[PDB]
Amino acid sequence: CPFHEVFNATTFASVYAWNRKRISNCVADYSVIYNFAPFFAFKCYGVSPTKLNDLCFTNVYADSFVIRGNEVSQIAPGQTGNIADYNYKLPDDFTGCVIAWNSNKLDSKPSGNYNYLYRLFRKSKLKPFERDISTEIYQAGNKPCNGVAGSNCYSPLQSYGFRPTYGVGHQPYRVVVLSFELLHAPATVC
C-alpha cells in the first residue's frame, strides 16, 4: 500500500492543520516503514507492534505533521498542554500507533524558518479528533477588536523559530499517527 509516499512526502503540513490521509481496500505490509533507521519515539496503544500485519481492519487514517521535540510527549491519550489541548486531541479509547523522528537536516536553515505555525490562543479546548483552521484576530477583554491588532487583540498563530544551532529540544521532529477502524463493513485491509 502507498505508505511509502506518506512517509516520504517532501513537505509536511503545519501543526494547526495536520495532514490526514485515508487508506482502505489495500494490502498492509507495515514492515517497510522500518526502512528509516532512526526513530526517536515509536509507540502503539491497543495493538502489539510485532503483530500489526496479522490483523484485519475496515480502514486506517494517517495524520502527519511536524512539531518540536519537547512537545512530542503531548501526543498520548489523556494529555494536556499547548498542543494536546488546541491542535490535536487523542480520545482515551485509542487503538493505533504514533511515530516521531528528528528532522534537523531537512527542516532547519541558518536564516530561520517561519513556514510552520502552531495555534496559541483559543476560547475552548478542541474536541477529540477535531480541527479548526480559521485565521482571526483573537480578542481579549470586553472591548471589540473590530479586526485590528492592539492592546488586547492578537494573532492566534505563533511561528516556530528553527535554526540548525538550536538545542536537541528545539530541532523539529516529524510525527505521524496511524489510527485503525473496524466496523460493520467487511474487513478489507489485511
Partner: antibody, heavy 115, light 85 residues
C-alpha cells in the same frame, strides 16, 4: 534577567536601555517596560508581543520606541526627549500567554534608575 | 496588625473582572501575588486571597506572618492603558 543603559543624563536628549534574558524560550512571551517615579506608585510604558510588535502608552506614544533582537535575545527601549521630569527607575517585566488568559507581570527584573 | 487585615480597590468608570495584586518590600522588585481575581499564583503559602467582582475588589489575609510588611498594589488589564493604585 539583566539590564543596562545610561545612568546619568542631561535634559533635552535621548535615552536608551537594554533588557537581556538568559533563556532560549524568548519567543513566546510578552515583554513590558514599567516606570516608577521616585517613591510614587508606578507607571506602564509599553509592551512587545510574541510576534515582534509593540503597543505604546498613549501619553508617551510618539516619544517612546520599543524594539527586539531575536539573534541575541534582547529588548531595547528608547526615549527621544529626556528632561528632569522623567527621573525614575525602570523594570523589565514578562507575561506568559495561557489559553484565553495572560498572567501579566509574573517576573520582574532588577531595573535601573535614570535622571 | 497581628491577626487580620483587609483592603479594597475600586474603579470609577467602567467595570471589569481583571485585576492583579502585587507585593513590594524595601528596595526589592515587586512580586505578583494574585492574578485574575481569586486565581492564585503558585507561590502563595499564607492564604493571600481576595475574591470579588463589580468595582469592589477586595484583598484579604488570614494571618500576618513575620515577613508581611509591604505596600501591596492593585492593577488593571483592560481599558488601556493599565493604571495602578
Amino acid at each position: 534577567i539583566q539590564q543596562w543603559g545610561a545612568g546619568l543624563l542631561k535634559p533635552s536628549e535621548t535615552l536608551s536601555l537594554t533588557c537581556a534574558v538568559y533563556d532560549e524560550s524568548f519567543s513566546d512571551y510578552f515583554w513590558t517596560w514599567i516606570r516608577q517615579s521616585p517613591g510614587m506608585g508606578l507607571e506602564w510604558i509599553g509592551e512587545v508581543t510574541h510576534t515582534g510588535s509593540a503597543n505604546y502608552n498613549p501619553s508617551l506614544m510618539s516619544r517612546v520606541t520599543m524594539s527586539r533582537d531575536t539573534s541575541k535575545n534582547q529588548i531595547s527601549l528608547k526615549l527621544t526627549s529626556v528632561t528632569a521630569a522623567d527621573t525614575a527607575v525602570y523594570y523589565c517585566a514578562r507575561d506568559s500567554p495561557l489559553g484565553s488568559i495572560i498572567k501579566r507581570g509574573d517576573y520582574w527584573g532588577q531595573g535601573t534608575l535614570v535622571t | 496588625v497581628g491577626d487580620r487585615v483587609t483592603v479594597t480597590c475600586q474603579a470609577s468608570q467602567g467595570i471589569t473582572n481583571y485585576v492583579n495584586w502585587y507585593q513590594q518590600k524595601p528596595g526589592k522588585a515587586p512580586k505578583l501575588l494574585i492574578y485574575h481575581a481569586s486565581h492564585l499564583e503558585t507561590g502563595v503559602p499564607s492564604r493571600f486571597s481576595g475574591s470579588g467582582s463589580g468595582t469592589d475588589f477586595t484583598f484579604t489575609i488570614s494571618s500576618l506572618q513575620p515577613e508581611d510588611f509591604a505596600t501591596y498594589y492593585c492593577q488593571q488589564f483592560d481599558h488601556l492603558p493599565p493604571t495602578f493604585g
